[PDB]
Design an enzyme around this catalytic site. Structure first.
Site, mmCIF file in Angstrom:
data_model
loop_
_atom_site.group_PDB
_atom_site.id
_atom_site.type_symbol
_atom_site.label_atom_id
_atom_site.label_comp_id
_atom_site.label_asym_id
_atom_site.label_seq_id
_atom_site.Cartn_x
_atom_site.Cartn_y
_atom_site.Cartn_z
ATOM 1 C CG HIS A 83 -0.630 0.222 2.498
ATOM 2 N ND1 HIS A 83 -0.122 -0.936 3.186
ATOM 3 C CD2 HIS A 83 -0.460 1.223 3.402
ATOM 4 C CE1 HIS A 83 0.042 -0.288 4.610
ATOM 5 N NE2 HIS A 83 0.013 0.852 4.531
ATOM 6 C CG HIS A 85 -0.083 4.413 4.677
ATOM 7 N ND1 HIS A 85 -0.651 3.615 5.628
ATOM 8 C CD2 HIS A 85 -0.787 5.421 4.173
ATOM 9 C CE1 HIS A 85 -1.772 4.471 5.606
ATOM 10 N NE2 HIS A 85 -1.924 5.455 4.793
ATOM 11 C CG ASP A 87 4.136 0.724 6.805
ATOM 12 O OD1 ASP A 87 3.441 1.223 5.923
ATOM 13 O OD2 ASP A 87 3.771 -0.012 7.908
ATOM 14 C CG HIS A 148 -3.682 -0.079 6.987
ATOM 15 N ND1 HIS A 148 -3.528 0.203 8.337
ATOM 16 C CD2 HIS A 148 -2.935 0.380 6.439
ATOM 17 C CE1 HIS A 148 -2.567 1.047 8.343
ATOM 18 N NE2 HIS A 148 -2.185 1.414 7.199
ATOM 19 C CG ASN A 179 -2.546 5.879 10.464
ATOM 20 O OD1 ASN A 179 -3.396 6.712 10.766
ATOM 21 N ND2 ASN A 179 -1.650 5.948 9.596
HETATM 22 ZN ZN ZN Z 1 -0.391 1.937 6.635
HETATM 23 ZN ZN ZN Z 2 1.708 -0.072 9.055
#
Ligand code: ZN
Ligand code: ZN
Length: 227
Positions: A83, A85, A87, A148, A179
């Protein structure tokens, strides 16, 4: 003896052997007032390695490449971000400079760009609708639906029945969903149910953050999100 943050020196990465030709990678990063570990995957792809996700930032991702070369010694030729983000994509520029071909779904690429995060080079086709699965060398990529994040993918390694859930899957000890700013809390339990139905033979389940376990992580995730 799965590594946790207290075992990982700042800016370093550990690898953990999951199965033959399957490793996780663990690094730590500051986020929202705390230090989190996060997981990625390494899968033997013939004479090459397939990387799943960065190690959360440029520094960690550089350390990841050095640790792979030291422990495994095969070239990382492709990486998939699960995804948009940091990380998952933070470190893409390092991977590209190192000669790794970077991949993500069209949705992940669009969201990354809009967020001002690093953008994987290549688009993954055939993952645009919930339930879609494609083969990518020694793994299957699966799009379970919004959880998520709207774009989150999961990864299955058929040789070892390893399910890598990314941040759509919570570790057992998680108390919150973490988150949820880009999450679809309504759809998430249903997306997790699609994972459960699609991978009933999974033997190891690796969360986006923390300790691997079994299929129990999937139910635990559904329960936490419902609450
Ligand atoms: Zn994430
Ligand atoms: Zn994460």
């Amino acid at each position: 003896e799965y590594p946790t943050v207290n075992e990982i020196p700042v800016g370093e990465v550990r690898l953990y052997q999951i199965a033959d030709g399957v490793w996780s990678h663990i690094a730590t990063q500051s986020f929202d007032g705390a230090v989190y570990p996060s997981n990625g995957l390494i899968v033997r792809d013939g004479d090459e390695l397939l990387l799943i996700d960065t190690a959360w930032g440029a520094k960690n991702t550089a350390a990841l490449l050095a640790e792979i070369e030291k422990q495994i010694g095969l070239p990382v030729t492709r990486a998939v971000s699960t995804h948009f983000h940091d990380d998952r994509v933070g470190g893409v520029d390092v991977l590209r400079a190192a000669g790794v071909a970077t991949y993500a779904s069209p949705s992940t690429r669009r969201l990354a760009e809009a967020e001002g995060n690093e953008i994987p080079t290549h688009s993954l086709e055939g993952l645009s609708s919930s339930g879609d699965a494609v083969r990518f060398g020694p793994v299957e990529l699966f799009y379970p639906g919004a959880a998520h994040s709207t774009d989150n993918l999961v990864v299955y390694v058929p040789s070892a029945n390893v399910l890598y859930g990314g941040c759509a899957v919570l570790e057992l000890s998680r108390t919150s969903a973490g988150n949820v700013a880009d999450a679809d809390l309504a759809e998430w339990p249903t997306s997790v149910e699609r994972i459960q139905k699609h991978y009933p033979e999974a033997e190891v389940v690796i969360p986006g953050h923390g300790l691997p376990g079994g299929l129990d992580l999937l139910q635990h995730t559904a329960n936490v999100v419902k609450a």
